[PDB]
Amino acid sequence: MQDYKQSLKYETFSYLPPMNAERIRAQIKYAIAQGWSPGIEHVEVKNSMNQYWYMWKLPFFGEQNVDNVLAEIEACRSAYPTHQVKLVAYDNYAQSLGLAFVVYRGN
Amino acid sequence: MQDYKQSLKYETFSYLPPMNAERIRAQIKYAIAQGWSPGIEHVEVKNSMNQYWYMWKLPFFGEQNVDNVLAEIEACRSAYPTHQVKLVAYDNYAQSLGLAFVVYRGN
Amino acid sequence: VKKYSAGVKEYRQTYWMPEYTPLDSDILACFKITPQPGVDREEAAAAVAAESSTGTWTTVWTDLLTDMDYYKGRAYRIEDVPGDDAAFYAFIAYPIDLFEEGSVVNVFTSLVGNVFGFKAVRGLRLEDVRFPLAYVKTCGGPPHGIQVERDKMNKYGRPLLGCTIKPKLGLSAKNYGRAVYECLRGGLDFTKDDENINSQPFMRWRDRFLFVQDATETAEAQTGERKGHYLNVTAPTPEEMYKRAEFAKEIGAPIIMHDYITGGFTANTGLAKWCQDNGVLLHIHRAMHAVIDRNPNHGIHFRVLTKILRLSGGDHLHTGTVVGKLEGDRASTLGWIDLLRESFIPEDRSRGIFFDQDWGSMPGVFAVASGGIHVWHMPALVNIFGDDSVLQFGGGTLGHPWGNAAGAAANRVALEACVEARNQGRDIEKEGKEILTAAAQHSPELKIAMETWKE
Amino acid sequence: VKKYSAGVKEYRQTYWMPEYTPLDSDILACFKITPQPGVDREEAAAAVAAESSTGTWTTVWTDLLTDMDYYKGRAYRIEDVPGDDAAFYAFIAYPIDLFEEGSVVNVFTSLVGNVFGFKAVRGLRLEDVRFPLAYVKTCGGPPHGIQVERDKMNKYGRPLLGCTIKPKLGLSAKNYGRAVYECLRGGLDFTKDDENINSQPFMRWRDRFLFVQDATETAEAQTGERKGHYLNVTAPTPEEMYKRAEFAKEIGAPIIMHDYITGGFTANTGLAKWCQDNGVLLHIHRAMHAVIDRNPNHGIHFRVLTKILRLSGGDHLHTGTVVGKLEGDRASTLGWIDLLRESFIPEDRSRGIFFDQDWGSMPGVFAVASGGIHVWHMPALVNIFGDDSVLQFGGGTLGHPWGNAAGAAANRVALEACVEARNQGRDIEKEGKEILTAAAQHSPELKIAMETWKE
Amino acid sequence: VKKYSAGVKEYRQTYWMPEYTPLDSDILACFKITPQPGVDREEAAAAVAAESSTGTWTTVWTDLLTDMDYYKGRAYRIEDVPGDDAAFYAFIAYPIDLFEEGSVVNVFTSLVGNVFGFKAVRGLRLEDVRFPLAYVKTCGGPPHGIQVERDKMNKYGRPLLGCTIKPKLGLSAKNYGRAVYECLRGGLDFTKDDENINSQPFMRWRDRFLFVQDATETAEAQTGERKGHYLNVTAPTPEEMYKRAEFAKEIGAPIIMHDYITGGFTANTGLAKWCQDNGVLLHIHRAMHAVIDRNPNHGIHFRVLTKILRLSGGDHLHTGTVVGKLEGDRASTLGWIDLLRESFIPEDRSRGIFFDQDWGSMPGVFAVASGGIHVWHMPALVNIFGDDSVLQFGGGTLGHPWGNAAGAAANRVALEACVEARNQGRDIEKEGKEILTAAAQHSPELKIAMETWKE
Amino acid sequence: VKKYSAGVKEYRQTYWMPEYTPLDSDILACFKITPQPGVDREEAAAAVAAESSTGTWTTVWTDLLTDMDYYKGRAYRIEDVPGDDAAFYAFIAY
Amino acid sequence: PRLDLIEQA
Amino acid sequence: PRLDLIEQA
Amino acid sequence: PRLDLIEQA
Amino acid sequence: PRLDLIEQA
Amino acid sequence: PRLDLIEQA
Amino acid sequence: PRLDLIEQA
């Protein structure tokens, strides 16, 4: 029998191994193909459970290029290198997030 | 698109560039010309949202000389060099503050 | 008829209107009727329209005090059943005025509750009911629905994971909270009371609520993810039901559950209104293929019951398992899901849908999958239910060889591996084993879970 | 079992106890089980005992936190069904600790509500349930019962006469009260709302209550006999149900009714407690042989539902008609009656009674006969139901050629002629026609009633 | 008149008192009356005094039961309108006894609500109303007013900045809170619900309140300045209105808003009393130049409505935009502002003020500027409204090319640059461009805002 | 519109739907509109549909968070007033 | 009735 | 979801 | 404000 | 009245 | 009484 | 304790 080690988690996909560039890219491709608008949120690690993280600029409404989203993830990282950074995908038909996952767990 | 950088603010005029001596002087001149009594409040930075800051001495009721107010601002600064310092102007006709702004953001 | 003549009469001349076009406001019903031998189809359909509306077994003089032509239910079409020959389909329209606003069972029990036959029908079965939008707008519906629930719990991009605490009965409150705590800290979004956990001698409800809530807060702090436990407020009386719900709200429990079978419509509808007033999520359990919805030629079909439960109100709805069901009824599983979640369901005989059902803006309901499901079911479950579902793994979590936390983690890893693979475009049902096997390379909990139960 | 071993296991070794003698406090259940092919009877019976109690489809470690041997349901005997061979009878005992006190459906839904099979059973049917006296004492039961109801209404020596107002739907409140007034002044003890008369656009509930109560008071003054009308308080929410019941009490209505199917157990149990607190008689309608209780090999038998309704509480209970039923099920009709009214019902397989049912001091319930019955049915009805019953003649009264008052009088004369003849020692069923014909010589209303409907 | 004589009579002899000097307690009204052709001015003025007080179209005997001379409204002066010739000014005095204390609309609807003409007037328009101090003291007035609001929010020395979230409808609660959070952290003092954001299917009110409050707390912590969001409690019923206001207070929201047009006087007055009892600031929206106050010869002038709103109670008042209005109505804009904020407003015909209005100690109200305003409007806005105002930039903030935070900062920089320049003695309206251009050198957000919309 | 572009825009392209058949559930309104001089009828009818529903005097980015096509009021027919010529009838569905 | 058919009898 | 599959669409 | 412009003044 | 002039008629 | 001796009179 | 010494045992 193995003992389960308790650690903080980061919602969807945080129980998988941390994503490389290809796995992140594939999720953004999925969100765009669903017609969702990618967006970037960031927050201080201690505030990760708030409903309202900082929004990075505006959601990239009608963005079709995955590389633009990746560049803005990098831009947000540089602006707030200690913040947790989350990739969200807005679904205007459901007025929900079709997808959301943390790309950088912060420090 | 530029990202808006979140920082703490200090109410009226804190969204303008920090005031030099002439801009501070002009505001005190305005308050005196309105018939308001200048006063000085100060508080520890973490308590800046309290309703009751420390009052520096008494409001300078019927003070007409701008330089006296400036000197008392300096005196309050020296007495509490880590405190936020606020210039208030009492309006006894409205029993309100006609004007209030932070002259030193504290440390 | 303008004049009173006492005596038994046929119903065909009043209650069979083959030229009737249903109004948009009409409640429409599709009955599978097997008539008594000798009785014509048009007469038997007329008999069901009479008994479920303004008809009496003998002529009454009080009919002449009102206008029957406006108020009566009237059968307007008859269709053969594809397969049977004894039975036929009767389509009967009911004026919306026949029913109490916001009381959808008053529709239901009028239709089949007390409809014995008028000596013309030997077999009845309610297949579908078209609730017009005008009537839908009068019902409370889900207190929050899928989108608001996701916003309240801050959960996006995957099905939610749940687990009923086992054994179903027998655990003390503190031991119950221990099981809950271990499941929640391991990666489940929710735990839940068993449907028949109310307030028993071995575990009084108030003690359970307190320990469970302490377990929920602890695991939430230790995972950084929102957690919940469906506290069962099903109670012998409405006062007791409301009292337990109030205590759930008082201690900060985000979600409660109600056994619709135990409690009944009146309690459930009141509870759903209470939940919307108090911002508490409401999980509904109503077993189907059990007493009511299992017999294929006798009873009320589960899609009618599904419509009722959505109107009565619930943020989650659970009946039985879907994966163990055959590929044939999977099409009926997909149609069941759509009635729960979609705004407009078009008519489709192949799925058993005889009318367009318009929900308008009524929120959708989370579909819940349970049963004896474990990690190996995860690919099929993700593929069938999609994201707007709750996958409950009771035994699949507490039956893990390393305990609840490891079991919760195994299911959480399996779920996320399937969701990620689906988002990558892979056919997760065909590639299920490979997806789980690969994810099992990084999750020892998942690895031994796959060895505990069979593919 | 003292040690934890994950994995699916058989249930026979834990949940099949052929040497178990049930404790007097045990809830006993008799299931007609058809097992999956290949599965042994002892295993399938064990599977039903497990799933309806402390069993899980796979072994869970939390079982070891409690004592299963005390808490588990355990099958203790298996018997062949006389006639079938696929099915068998499983007798399963449940410790009384498994259930919430005073919440008899928590017993019911634990037993069959959510019991799918654990992959060992392909067919389940709950035949009888022994509620031990210890559990019976925790339930509210009828708010008044037969003897107190007769004392409150000052009615002795005969069945009570009732009538549902017809048409079932469509009458305005004032016209509803007119029909009620005419029936009551003609000789009926009660009238009643139809089960699906709640608060519709054509007749709002408060207007109905007022006009009906005015009708009731008027007819009572003009006959010198106590009168009542079952005001239907069935409502979408408990608050609304209680509000209507409170208004019934406020205006002096002696009796209300509740559609158990529409409302549900929780609402009904709360209403029955309210009725005892407020001295209001409670009539219960629960259709049987409808959805739930009609299928002979799939579902819950009506005698189990009858026991539940008595414990949940009601002064009257109505399901369906008894005379149209065949002479074969008349023995089942007589057994149904006894479960409602008697204090101790001995076991009798011929009537479907598998356990001695002890009610102790729990009051009996008036049995209600309805359906398409008229004067010609009166001899059989008096003979079958006896004095402690309510005979409801809806169409039989409002369908009289001379209107409600004459119809009420015809039924009242027929009833009293049958009761008088019975008290004289005559065999009223064999001599029924002669008894009615003789009474018809003095009652023109009865005379034409007998000409309106066929012997 | 001491004797009763039935029949239609003229009103001049009772309701036209040219020698009447108004008492200090009289409610005074100035009507612009266009009489029916042939009717004398003194008669038509008398007709309006009669119909708005104790007059009837025909003589009634009940007049002699009371003293008309004390109670009647009486016209006491007539003046020509400068410009028109058909119309004239009637000054009518009403004894204070005619009105319910603390119910200022009872004054208003008595005056013009139901005053059709008595066949002597073809055109009516209420220009001004003198509420005597005695009556003012009976009204609740603003729950806090300018000075207390500044003390509660700790805001001094400048106008406050606000912003309505856009789009007006369609955003989910969480997305709504995101927009709010971004605006507040960028430098706005307030955000607000749109007037017609109540509780819609896309965003239920309780979810909105929670997410907005989380947004407000977050931005307050990250700026070190007090923040607020006007939560719209406008509701279909008063119970619902109070419930939402109570939830706003419960979660710590400092300020709520009420659409006076939607809600009405009774709801607003009750809400304002509630706000004073619970220390919540109250923002009032009442559109003017819309249906009621736009027609210059037909309707109620906005200054009368302004007086009513101050008495009814509100800490902020908003109607329409002021800068887009012409320089001519700027004098009417300045007079409007003074009625809101000052204690004593002297008579001034040039501004439309026909009576001295004494408010005594009744607190002033923040004047609110909105409309399609952006940074370029800031100099004019600061100059016109001065410090005791709220400048709301909905589109001007959320329409910034770099998003809400940058837009909020641009407006905040523009506002503070204008205030600083004003305090330095510069003519900020004449030097507006130079002031903004200089401040834009240090604020890239402001720089591109000035490039986004035209000077 | 899928992309955010700040600035004042006309309403005709979003709020004037001459091919729209009102749903049975739609709130229908008939306005007698007198437009500002120069403004086309279809634009003014679109302006009333916008302001009485999901429209703003300038483009807001929050429109893209929801589906305007579902929620907007849209003018679907214009008719002359019998007698006047300045005014016209706008039929708007909500 | 009531106490005629008791288990006690 | 929600408004993707409306009768309006 | 408030008491600056009173009728008393 | 009431049901004489219905849309149903 | 009441309105006989008013300040108005 | 509790269930060790039951009548059932």
Q: Which H or E run contains E162?
A: strand E160-162
Domain range enclosing B24: 1-107
Residue that the structure tokens 């209300």 belong to: D256
Nearest-Cα residue of chain H relative to residue F21: H8
Is H9 in contact with F23 (Cβ distance < 8 A)?
no
Quick one: DSSP state of residue E260? H
Q: How far apart are CA E77 and CA E89, in angstroms?
A: 8
Q: Which residues make Cβ contacts (< 8 Å) with residue D45, sequence separation at least 6?
A: D15, D16, D31, D33, D75, D78, D88, D90, D92
**Residue D77 bridge partners (DSSP):** D91
Structure-token pair, residue C106: 């008053």
Domain ranges within chain E, ordered by starting residue: 11-137, 146-452
Q: Show the tokens assigned to D402.
A: 């001379």
**C402: nearest CB among A2, A16, A96:** A2
DSSP letters for E319-363:
-S-SSSS-HHHHHHHHHHHHHHH-SEE--BGGGTB-S-EE-TTPP
Residue D208 near residue D171 (C-beta atoms within 8 A): no
Longest dimension (CA), chain J: 14
Handedness of CA B53, B55, B59, B64 (dihedral sign): negative
User: Which residue in the set A59, A62, A93 is minimally distant from F67, CB to CB?
Assistant: A93
Q: Provide CB contacts within 8 A for E421, sequence distance 6+.
A: E428, E431, E435
The verdict on a CB contact (< 8 Å) between B3 and A58 is: no
3-state SS of chain C is CCCCCCECCCCHHHHECCCCCCCCCCEEEEEEEEECCCCCHHHHHHHHHHHCCCCCCCECHHHHHCCHHHHCCEEEEEEECCCCCCCEEEEEEECHHHCCCCCHHHHHHHHHHCCCCCCCEEECEEEEEECCHHHHCCCCCCCCHHHHHHHHHCCCCCCEEECECCCCCCCCHHHHHHHHHHHHHHCCCEEECCCCCCCECCECHHHHHHHHHHHHHHHHHHHCCCCEEEEECCCCCHHHHHHHHHHHHHCCCCEEEEEHHHHCHHHHHHHHHHHHHHCCEEEEECCCCCCCCCCCCCEECHHHHHHHHHHHCCCEEECCCCCCCCHHHHHHHHHHHHHHHCCEECCEHHHCECCCEECCCCCCCEEEECCCCCHHHHHHHHHHHCCCEEEECCHHHHCCCCCHHHHHHHHHHHHHHHHHHHHCCCCCCCCHHHHHHHHHCCCHHHHHHHHHCCC
Give phi and psi for A58, each to the nearest 5: -115, 160
CB contact under 8 A, D266 and C234: yes
Distance from CA of A32 to the nearest CA of F (A): 12
Q: Determine how many CB atoms are found less than 10 A away from the CB of residue C311.
A: 27
C-alpha R_g of chain I? 5
CA dihedral over E262, E266, E270, E275, signed as positive or negative? positive
Is D195 assigned a ligand-binding role in the annotation? yes
Burial (Cβ within 10 Å: 0-12, 13-18, ≥19) of residue C367:
buried
Assigned token pair, C105:
């069972």
Inter-chain residue contact G1 with D146, CB threshold 8 Å: yes
Helices then strands, each counted (H, E), chain I: 0, 0
Cis peptide bond upstream of A59, omega within 30: no
Q: How many other C-beta atoms lie within 10 A of the C-beta of residue C369?
A: 26
CA distance D42 to D241: 46
Does D32 belong to an annotated binding site? no
Name the phi and psi angles at C374, rounded to 5: -140, -170
Determine the Cα–Cα distance for residues C76 and C90; give it in Å rounded to an integer.
8
Show the beta-strand stretches assigned E in I1-9.
none
Dihedral sign (CA D379, D385, D388, D391): negative
Q: Is E168 among the annotated ligand-binding positions?
A: yes
d(CA F52, CA F64): 19
Contact: E67, K3; criterion CB under 8 Å? yes
- Is the alpha carbon torsion for E209, E212, E218, E222 positive or negative? negative
Compute the nearest-CA separation of C222 from chain A (Å): 6
**One CATH from 1.10.3720.10, 3.90.180.10, 3.30.70.150, 3.40.710.10 for D11-137:** 3.30.70.150
Q: Can you tell me the distance from the alpha carbon of C91 to that of C49, in angstroms, rounded to the nearest whole number? A: 9
Token code pair at residue C200: 């028993």
Query: Which stretches of chain G are DSSP H helices?
Result: none
CB atoms within 10 A of CB D269: 27
Identity of residue C204: R
Backbone angles phi, psi at D127, to 5 degrees: -90, -50
Q: How far apart are the first and last CA of chain I?
A: 12
Distance CA D265, CA D103 (A): 9
Closest Cα in chain I to E388: I1
Sign for the CA dihedral angle at E216, E218, E221, E224 comes to negative
User: Other C-beta atoms within 10 Å of C224: how many?
Assistant: 15
The answer for D 151-180 residues in CB contact with C (under 8 A) is 165-172, 175, 178-179
Q: Kindly identify which residue of chain F lies nearest to residue C132, measuring between CA atoms.
A: F25
Catalytic sites of C, residue numbers: 166, 285
Helices (H) and strands (E) counted in chain G, each on its own, are 0, 0
Tokens at C150, concatenated: 């996701």
> Residue C76 contacts by C-beta under 8 Å, 6 or more apart in sequence?
C17, C18, C19, C20, C21, C22, C91, C92, C93
Q: Backbone phi, then psi, for D293, in 5-degree steps?
A: -110, 20
Q: How many residues does chain B have?
A: 107
D337 backbone φψ class: left, alpha, beta (φ>0; ψ -120 to 50)? alpha
Contact at CB, E156 and B88, closer than 8 angstroms: yes
CB contact at 8 A, C401 and C355? no
Using CA atoms, how far residue A40 sits from A66, A86, C256, D128, E142, in Å, is 13, 6, 33, 62, 43
Smallest CA-to-CA distance from A106 within A79, A84, A87, A86 is with A84
**Number of DSSP helices (H) and strands (E) in chain K, helices first:** 0, 0
Distance between A65 CA and the closest CA of chain H, angstroms:
24
- Looking at the complex, report in whole angstroms how far the Cα of residue A37 sits from the nearest Cα belonging to chain B: 17
**Facing residue for E177 by CB, picked from A47, A51, A90:** A51
Query: Which residues are paired to C392 by β-bridges?
Result: C162
* DSSP category for residue E113: I
End-to-end C-alpha distance for chain F, whole angstroms: 20
Residues E403 and A72 sit within 8 Å (Cβ to Cβ) = no
Half-sphere exposure at residue D67, Cβ-oriented, CA atoms within 13 angstroms: 13
Distance CA E100, CA E104 (A): 8
Contacts of A among chains (3+ CB pairs under 8 A): B, C, E, F, H
Q: What is the DSSP string of D127-187?
A: EEEE--HHHHTTS---SSHHHHHHHHHT--SS-EEE-B-SSSS---HHHHHHHHHHHHHHT
Separation of alpha carbons E234 and E252, rounded Å: 18
3-state secondary structure of F82: coil
**E349 vs C77: CA distance, rounded Å:** 77
Q: Which residues are C231's β-sheet partners?
A: C256
Tell me the C-alpha distance between C182 and C445, whole Å. 14
Give the DSSP letter of residue E285.
Answer: E
Q: Does F5 touch chain E (CB under 8 A)?
A: no
DSSP 3-state assignment of D228? strand
Q: Does residue A61 sit in helix, strand or coil? A: coil
**Cα dihedral C12/C15/C17/C18 (nearest 10):** -60
For chain B, the domain total comes to: 1
Chains C vs E: touching, with 3+ CB pairs under 8 Å?
yes
Chains A and B touch (3+ CB pairs under 8 A): yes
Task: Please name the helix (run of DSSP H) or strand (run of DSSP E) that holds residue E317, with its range, or none.
Answer: strand E316-318
Judged by 3 or more CB pairs under 8 A, whether I touches L is no
Mode of pairing for the β-strands spanning E27-35 and A37-43 = unpaired
Cβ E443 vs Cβ E413: under 8 Å = yes
CATH number at residue A21: 3.30.190.10
Q: Edge to edge, what strands does the sheet with A96-104 contain?
A: A54-55, A37-43, A84-91, A96-104
CATH for F11-94, options being 3.40.630.30, 1.10.1670.40, 3.40.50.720, 3.30.70.150? 3.30.70.150
> Cβ of D343 under 8 Å from any chain C Cβ?
no
Q: Which helix (H) or strand (E) holds D334?
A: helix D327-341
What is the maximum span of chain A, computed from C-alpha positions, in angstroms? Answer: 50
Name, in order, each residue with C-beta under 8 angstroms of E397's C-beta and a sequence gap of 6 or more. Answer: E163, E183, E186, E188, E404, E407, E408, E410, E411
In contact, E243 and E199? CB cutoff 8 Å: no
Give the C-alpha separation, E268 to E238, whole Å.
10
D229 labelled catalytic: no
3-state DSSP assignment of residue B41? strand
The coordinates were experimentally obtained by cryo-EM
Cβ pair B95:E147 closer than 8 A: yes
The CATH classification number of C146-452 equals 3.20.20.110
List the catalytic residue out of D144, D227, D249, D285.
D285
Q: Name chain C contacts of A90, Cβ cutoff 8 Å.
A: none
Residues of E forming the active site: 166, 285
Contact present, E303 and E337 (Cβ < 8 Å): no
**G chain contacts of residue D367, beta-carbon cutoff 8 Å:** none
Residue E350, marked binder: no
In sequence order, the 6+-apart residues with CB closer than 8 A to the CB of E283 are E192, E230, E255, E256, E257, E258, E314, E315, E316, E318, E368
In single-letter form, the type of residue at position E104 comes to V
Q: Do H2 and C356 touch (CB under 8 A)?
A: no
Q: How many CA atoms lie within 13 A of E143 on its CB side?
A: 26
Nearest to E93, CA basis, from E117, E72, E123: E72
How many Å lie between the alpha carbon of E352 and the closest alpha carbon of chain B?
26
Residue type, E92: I
Judge whether D11-137 and D146-452 match in fold: no
Q: Which amino acid is at E325?
A: K
- Look up residue A39 and give its amino acid: G
Neighbouring chains of L at 3+ CB pairs under 8 Å are: D
Sign of the dihedral defined by the CA atoms of residues E115, E118, E124, E125, in that order: negative
Q: Which residues on neighbouring strands pair with residue E367, listed in sequence order?
A: E317, E389
Per residue, the 3-state secondary structure of D374-399, as one string, reads CHHHHHHHHHHHCCCEEEECCHHHHC
D164 is in an annotated binding site: yes
Residue partners of A11: CB distance under 8 A and separation at least 6: A100, A101, A102, C154, C155, C156, C225
| Number of A–F residue contacts, CB under 8 Å | 22
Virtual CA dihedral for D351, D353, D354, D358, nearest 10 degrees?
A: -150
Beta strand D228-232 with D255-259 is: parallel
Helices (H), D24-119: 41-51, 68-71, 104-108
Instruction: State which H helix or E strand residue B30 sits in.
Output: helix B21-33
Q: What's the Cα-to-Cα distance from C28 to each of C112, C131, C169, rounded to whole Å?
A: 13, 7, 43
For C148, the closest chain E residue by CA position comes to: E207
D168 is in an annotated binding site: yes
Whether residue E310 is annotated as binding a ligand: the answer is no
Interface test mutation site (partner K, options E21, E54, E70, max chain K beta carbons within 10 A): E70
Sign of CA dihedral C169, C172, C173, C174: negative
**Resolution, rounded to a tenth of an Å?**
2.1
Is D249 a known active-site residue? no
Q: Cα separation of B35 and I3, whole Å? A: 14
Q: Quick check: C129 and C107 in contact, CB under 8 A? A: yes
Contact A57 B3 (CB under 8 A): yes
Rounded distance, CA A80 to CA A77, Å?
5
D343 assigned to a ligand binding site: no
Contacts of D390 (CB under 8 A, 6+ apart): D159, D160, D161, D162, D189, D190, D316, D318, D366, D367, D368, D369
Place of tokens 């009454």: C60
Q: What are the chain L neighbours of D23 within 8 Å (beta carbons)?
A: 7-8
Q: What is the DSSP letter of D294?
A: -
- The reply to whether residue D67 touches residue L3, judged by beta carbons under 8 angstroms, is yes
Query: Inter-chain contact C148–E174, Cβ cutoff 8 Å?
Result: no
Instruction: Give CA angle at D309 (D304, D313), nearest 5°.
Output: 150
| H or E segment and range at residue D284 | strand D281-285
**Beta carbons of B29 and B66 less than 8 angstroms apart:** yes
The single residue listed with the structure tokens 């009732």 is D162
**Closest C-alpha to D105, from D307, D273, D258, D284:** D307
Q: How many Cβ pairs closer than 8 A exist between chain D and G? A: 22
Determine phi and psi for D295, rounding to 5 degrees.
Answer: -70, 125
B residues 71-100 lying closer than 8 A (beta carbon) to I: 91, 93-96
Q: Do chains G and D touch (3 or more CB pairs under 8 A)?
A: yes
Verify cis geometry, omega within 30 degrees of 0, for the bond prior to D35.
Answer: no
| Partners of residue B2 in chain A, C-beta under 8 Å | 57
In this complex, do A52 and E210 lie within 8 Å of one another by their Cβ atoms?
no
Tokens for C148, please give them. Answer: 């608001």
Neighbouring-strand partners of residue D79: D89
Distance CA B12, CA B28 (A): 14
Residue A22 carries which side chain, given as an amino acid letter? E
**Please, which residues 94-153 of chain D have a Cβ atom closer than 8 Å to chain L?**
95
Kindly give, in sequence order, each residue whose CB lies less than 8 Å from that of residue C238, ignoring residues fewer than 6 positions away. Answer: C266, C267, C270, D238, D241, D242, D266, D267, D270
Distance between CA F49 and CA E171 in Å, rounded?
Answer: 19
F88-93, strands of its sheet edge to edge: F28-33, F88-93, F74-80
Residues 6+ apart with CB under 8 A from E152: B51, E144, E254, E279, E281
Count of positions (residues) in chain E? 455
The pair of structure tokens assigned to E131 is 């509420």
DSSP 3-state percent helix, strand, coil across chain H (nearest 5):
0, 0, 100
